[PDB]
Amino acid sequence: PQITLWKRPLVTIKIGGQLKEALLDTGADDTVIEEMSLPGRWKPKMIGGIGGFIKVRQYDQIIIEIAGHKAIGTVLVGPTPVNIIGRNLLTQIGATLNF
Amino acid sequence: PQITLWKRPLVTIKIGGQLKEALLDTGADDTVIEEMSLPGRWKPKMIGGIGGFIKVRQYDQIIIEIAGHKAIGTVLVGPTPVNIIGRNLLTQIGATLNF
Ligand SMILES: COc1ccc(S(=O)(=O)N(CC(C)C)C[C@@H](O)[C@H](Cc2ccccc2)NC(=O)c2cc(C)cc(C(=O)N(C)Cc3nc(C)oc3C)c2)cc1
Ligand SMILES: [Cl-]
Ligand SMILES: [Cl-]
Ligand SMILES: [Cl-]
Ligand code: NA
Ligand code: NA
Ligand code: NA
Q: Could you tell which of B46, B47, B50, B54 is best to mutate to test the pocket of ligand 1, judged by most ligand atoms within 8 Å of the CB?
A: B50
Fill in the amino acid letter for A47: I
How far apart (Å, rounded) are the C-alpha atoms in residues B34 and A9? 25
**How was this entry determined?**
X-ray
Using CB atoms, which residue from A51, A93, A96 is nearest to B54? A51
Q: Which residues pair with B73 in a beta bridge?
A: B62
Per-residue DSSP letter, A94: T
Residue A96 makes CB contacts below 8 A (sequence gap 6+) with B2, B3, B4, B5, B97, B98, B99
Q: Which three-class secondary structure state does DSSP give residue B21?
A: strand
The Å distance, Cα B33 to ligand 5 centre, comes to: 37
Q: How far is CA B31 from CA A77, A81, B40, B64, B71, in A?
A: 26, 19, 17, 11, 12
Resolution number, Å: 1.1
CATH classification number, A1-99, choose in 3.40.50.720, 2.40.70.10, 2.40.50.140, 2.30.38.10: 2.40.70.10
Burial (Cβ within 10 Å: 0-12, 13-18, ≥19) of residue A26: buried
Residue B42 makes CB contacts below 8 A (sequence gap 6+) with B57, B58, B59, B77
Q: Could you tell me which of A17, A69, A78 has the C-alpha nearest to residue B97?
A: A69
How far apart (Å, rounded) are the C-alpha atoms in residues B90 and A14? 28
* Minimum-distance ligand 1 atom for the alpha carbon of B82: 14
**End-to-end CA, chain B:** 15
Q: Which residues of B touch A49 (CB under 8 A)?
A: 49-51, 81
How far apart (Å, rounded) are the C-alpha atoms in residues B75 and B55? 13
